[PDB]
Amino acid sequence: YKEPFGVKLDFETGIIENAKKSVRRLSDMKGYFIDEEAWKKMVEEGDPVVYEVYAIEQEEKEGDLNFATTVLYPGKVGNEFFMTKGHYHSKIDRAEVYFALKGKGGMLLQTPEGEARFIEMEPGTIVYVPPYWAHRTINTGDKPFIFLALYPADAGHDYGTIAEKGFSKIVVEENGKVVVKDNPK
Amino acid sequence: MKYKEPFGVKLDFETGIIENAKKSVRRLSDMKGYFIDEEAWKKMVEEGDPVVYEVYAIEQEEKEGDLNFATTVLYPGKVGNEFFMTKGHYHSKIDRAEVYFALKGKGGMLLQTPEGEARFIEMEPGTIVYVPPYWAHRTINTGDKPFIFLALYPADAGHDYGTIAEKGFSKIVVEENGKVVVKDNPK
Numbered sequence A: 001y002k003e004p005f006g007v008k009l010d011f012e013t014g015i016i017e018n019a020k021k022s023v024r025r026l027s028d029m030k031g032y033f034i035d036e037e038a039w040k041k042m043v044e045e046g047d048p049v050v051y052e053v054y055a056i057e058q059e060e061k062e063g064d065l066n067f068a069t070t071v072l073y074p075g076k077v078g079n080e081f082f083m084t085k086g087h088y089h090s091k092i093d094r095a096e097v098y099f100a101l102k103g104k105g106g107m108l109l110q111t112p113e114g115e116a117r118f119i120e121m122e123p124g125t126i127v128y129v130p131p132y133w134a135h136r137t138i139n140t141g142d143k144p145f146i147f148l149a150l151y152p153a154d155a156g157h158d159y160g161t162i163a164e165k166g167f168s169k170i171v172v173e174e175n176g177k178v179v180v181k182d183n184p185k
Numbered sequence B: 001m002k003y004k005e006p007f008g009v010k011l012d013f014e015t016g017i018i019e020n021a022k023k024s025v026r027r028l029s030d031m032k033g034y035f036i037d038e039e040a041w042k043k044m045v046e047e048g049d050p051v052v053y054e055v056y057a058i059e060q061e062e063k064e065g066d067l068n069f070a071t072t073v074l075y076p077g078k079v080g081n082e083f084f085m086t087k088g089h090y091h092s093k094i095d096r097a098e099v100y101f102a103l104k105g106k107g108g109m110l111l112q113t114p115e116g117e118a119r120f121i122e123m124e125p126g127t128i129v130y131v132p133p134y135w136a137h138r139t140i141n142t143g144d145k146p147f148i149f150l151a152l153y154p155a156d157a158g159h160d161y162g163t164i165a166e167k168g169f170s171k172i173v174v175e176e177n178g179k180v181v182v183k184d185n186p187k
Ligand SMILES: O=C(O)[C@H](O)[C@@H](O)[C@H](O)[C@H](O)COP(=O)(O)O
Pocket: A053, A055, A067, A068, A069, A070, A084, A085, A086, A087, A096, A135, A136, A137, A149, A151
């Protein structure tokens, strides 16, 4: 029997005690943002951190669970909001649940069929990511967007398809938040 | 195939209520044979049969890889000197894990293996508890205010209340000048 345990989540910083920290900067997201120019610039300008993850994962097993907080920093590449890479589950069949804790943003989801959905998120918002849906998180505010994510330990990660094809939509700023089609999709 | 639609639902940090969720209520009369002081139990039922806890759940069809989630509002109180608590259970597919995220109030979680080995983890706002496969779990409110938390579990985990309704937990959580976890006499 594995040992149960408790860990403290700081509602202000989004940091989970004893978690495994991962960091993703702009230089780690080449080929994701539409404005390749503005991208290249910002990188040489300082290669700012886009988001950080604090994860506690179990071994890949059916029926088990992993969880992690993400701190998605405010910003835009051109006029495209800072976002996570986005991914499907290796076992695409796996669902996921997100719980927004601080700031504001939204999640962009897409199916293999091609359907695209955008769900706005504010503190208190619980987002249900169904089986087969790829999903990416976007920060539409000027402050850090913090959320907790819980997912099957055997769900796995499939980034390839997204890095290749990309999402059928992009989330940009045009006075307000606009969800429009993605040219290179 | 025809996919299920994603969705966002609001959770009220202050009330523990989740919009559009399925509500369940458990009164003291719904927990007959759970508390050690059965005389104190009887008296409290006739005096008003208070609500011990309420659950707001959103569940999918019991299918592999999917997820259910629910909040619980566990009210403050005691039967004799035993803190208000949930019935407690093992998952139907016993090797399914679960994750709790405390949002308001103070309490703790009591866990045990099929063999009776127990663990008690304190919970306060911000505490995340990992319930490993095979462990039964019960939540306890050790405070004077509602203890609110969010729980996430596999949609095919199911519920096994039988063993516990029968033999209870190997331990009880009571107040004696403070919070104490002692052996369960009728266990
Ligand atoms: O698997 C996970 O750990 C969760 O889905 C979540 O923590 C996610 O990883 C981050 O938001 C980073 O975004 P991406 O992993 O989609 O690039």
